[PDB]
Amino acid sequence: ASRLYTLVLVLQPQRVLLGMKKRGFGAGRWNGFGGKVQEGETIEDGARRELQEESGLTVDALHKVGQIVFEFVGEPELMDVHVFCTDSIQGTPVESDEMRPCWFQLDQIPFKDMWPDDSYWFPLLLQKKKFHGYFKFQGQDTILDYTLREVDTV
């Protein structure tokens, strides 16, 4: 009962790219780039595709950095989120009707306007750690319970 999603962080030595969702769901928050994985498509290919669609950037190799499972109380489907990082990109970030990308210096990451789980796992990503997490949500703003640990193998 899990649906695959990807999440991509463009993390460079002094800054990280995030996107402000402008409409529909998740509007108002900063987040990484990603989406659903297609039938017959690899998870990594889906991650590369969604990075382009949402940010305008072209990535070659993506690196696996985490897996997070989200449970939403009252919803049957779990989200199985495969998290990736890259430092090398081509192109410059594109603002669209859906998404407004911006670079953040690492000390200015806007945690108060990001999903609450990011406060837990993003700091691991910044120190080049890999992780497995599980977050149980009630609505969009409340973590009821979670687990998180560093791993050697994603």
Added chain:
Amino acid sequence: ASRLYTLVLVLQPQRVLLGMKKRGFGAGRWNGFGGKVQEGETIEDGARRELQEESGLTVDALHKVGQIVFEFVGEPELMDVHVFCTDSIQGTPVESDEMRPCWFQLDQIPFKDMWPDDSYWFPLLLQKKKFHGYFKFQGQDTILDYTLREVDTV
């Protein structure tokens, strides 16, 4: 907002001692031996004392093997349980009005008539692993959420 408790498992190569609580709280289940720690008493001394009180056995050195925190929904105080093991004891187990001790072969540990958290951490103890756990209970029979991991240092 945590209260200290001890829990002692007499674990020998082929068998483990458990006690059937005969009355009051916990009646009807098999469990290890322990209780509250006194003012001015070390946690280990409290563990040794309670092993004698509840089982009739004298232990010298106890070995630290785990820490488990219990939360009961609707109750303010958490239980901070310090878990110990020993293989060497003196005396023979004593049945009292409060407790009926019995030896169990390791393949016959009565998990269905033990507290539900034991199904998670007891197998770690059997393989000489050390652990930190947290269990959130609703009533006596339902684990709502938990975390458990092996540790090098209790």
